Antibody, heavy 218, light 218 residues
Framework: QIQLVQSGPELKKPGETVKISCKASGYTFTTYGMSWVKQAPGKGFEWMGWINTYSGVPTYVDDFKGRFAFSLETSASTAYLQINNLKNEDTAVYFC????????????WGQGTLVTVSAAKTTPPSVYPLAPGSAAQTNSMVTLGCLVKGYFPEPVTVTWNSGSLSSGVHTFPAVLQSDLYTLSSSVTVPSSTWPSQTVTCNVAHPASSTKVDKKIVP | LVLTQSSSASFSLGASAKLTCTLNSQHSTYTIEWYQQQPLKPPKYVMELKKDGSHSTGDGIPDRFSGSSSGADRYLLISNIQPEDEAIYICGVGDTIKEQFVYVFGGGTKVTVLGQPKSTPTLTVFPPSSEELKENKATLVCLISNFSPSGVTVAWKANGTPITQGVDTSNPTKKGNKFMASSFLHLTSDQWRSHQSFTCQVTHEGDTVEKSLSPALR
């Protein structure tokens, strides 16, 4: 029942600011301090310091003096981390974590928030239907797909018939090549069910697009 | 380093696993903590482990996890290690350096569990869509599903001989039981049309499976 839920991924240019949130539930927020831990790609965990959730007083490790601010909204049981004048080397997953518990300092962790510091632009996906050429042979299974091509940054989400089609479905991990992501989802359905009945992939890229594509015979 | 961990370790499924975190002389009798890190999850507190080998385990840690010590060495033991125990294991240690708290995490040990029973991959391939060809582009889709353990290598062939321009994923869904991966070969529409065939070839724990796409087909 102790849960720490962090806000979603951020993509930011050098020089900019970012503020991420960590919402705590399942205990008395003001009873335990909140730590922050950085994990940069290809490095191990680095503790950043912590904030005393009663007194409001933060303590920063020397590496994180100057442009990092821990703050609280204690009424919403939420800790915040703001990083200012973002640097390439700030690219990392940031975790919040709270203590225990017999001088335990990292008993419970958030899931982490990726902050990418980059000049790469946000790029919405091109979505294509992956469909066999006509209705298939009698008494077969048909595999349909959507190709979600060339987007940045992650993630996209995919559903089929608005979530109502789930039995067919496999949504594969994104692949990065050049500066962009590609992903595919597939759904396998009985030859008697499609194309007589409509099947549509629904693709969202939370920067800020939603693409629906009805799969029809090519 | 204050904490030394080898970056990787492997163990036979169902055998005993033993991980070493070595403290430097100045911290040779310190208690350490063990954490488990898996993708898409909060990092997990695993145990506190004393110089004498006494330890307490965290919430939701199965009884197969144990700890012991010898001099500056701290060991995490996993009896009958299971596929779900694949993870990065990280040791940590706190201290006071002038009235100021310091905390130091090891670089982590990535643990793989070998000798698991194998399920061979299922492949699904899609040719370029009509829509994408009209844009003069052709992305060949290879979706790889229902396999265990983790980890496949994939190669594309053009006319039964190999090629490079098409990368893919890391190979996971550590939930369910099986894993998924995919690969995309990014071609022009002229390159698509001007070969007899293309082939997605997947190797999994030394067995390979393959499926082809033919431009003549559509």
């Amino acid at each position: 029942q102790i849960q720490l839920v962090q806000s979603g991924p951020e993509l930011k240019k050098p020089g900019e600011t970012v503020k991420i949130s960590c919402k705590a539930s399942g205990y008395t927020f003001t009873t335990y301090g909140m730590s922050w831990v950085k994990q940069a790609p290809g490095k191990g965990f680095e503790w950043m310091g912590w904030i005393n959730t009663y007194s409001g007083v933060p303590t920063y490790v020397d590496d994180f003096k100057g442009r990092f601010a821990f703050s609280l909204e204690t009424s919403a049981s939420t800790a915040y981390l703001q990083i200012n004048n973002l640097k390439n080397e700030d690219t990392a997953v940031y975790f919040c974590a709270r203590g225990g518990n017999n001088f335990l300092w990292f008993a419970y962790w958030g899931q982490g928030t990726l902050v990418t510091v980059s000049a790469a632009k946000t790029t919405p996906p091109s979505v294509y239907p992956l469909a066999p050429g006509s209705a298939a042979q009698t008494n077969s299974m048909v595999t349909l797909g959507c190709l979600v091509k060339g987007y940045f940054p992650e993630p996209v989400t995919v559903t089929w018939n608005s979530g109502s089609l789930s039995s067919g479905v496999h949504t594969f991990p994104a692949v990065l090549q050049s500066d962009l992501y590609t992903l595919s989802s597939s759904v396998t359905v009985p030859s008697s069910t499609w194309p007589s009945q409509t099947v549509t992939c629904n693709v969202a890229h939370p920067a800020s697009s939603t693409k629906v594509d009805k799969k029809i015979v090519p | 380093l204050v904490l030394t961990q080898s970056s990787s370790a492997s163990f036979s499924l169902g055998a005993s696993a033993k991980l070493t975190c070595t403290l430097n002389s100045q911290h040779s009798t310190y208690t350490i903590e063990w954490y488990q890190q898996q993708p898409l999850k909060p990092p997990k507190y695993v145990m506190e482990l004393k110089k004498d080998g006494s330890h307490s385990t965290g919430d939701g840690i199965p009884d197969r996890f144990s700890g012991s010590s010898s001099g500056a060495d701290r060991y995490l033991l996993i009896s009958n290690i299971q596929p779900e125990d694949e993870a990065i294991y990280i040791c940590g240690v706190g201290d006071t350096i002038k009235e100021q708290f310091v905390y130091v995490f090891g670089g982590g040990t990535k643990v793989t569990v070998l000798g698991q029973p194998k399920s061979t991959p299922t492949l699904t391939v899609f040719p370029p869509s009509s829509e994408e060809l009209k844009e003069n582009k052709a992305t060949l889709v290879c979706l790889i599903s229902n396999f265990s353990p983790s980890g496949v290598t994939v190669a594309w062939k053009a006319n039964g001989t190999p090629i490079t321009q098409g990368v893919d994923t890391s190979n996971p869904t550590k939930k369910g039981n099986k894993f998924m991966a995919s690969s995309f070969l990014h071609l022009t529409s002229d390159q698509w049309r001007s070969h007899q065939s293309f082939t997605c070839q997947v190797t999994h724990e030394g067995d390979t499976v393959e499926k082809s796409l033919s431009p003549a087909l559509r």
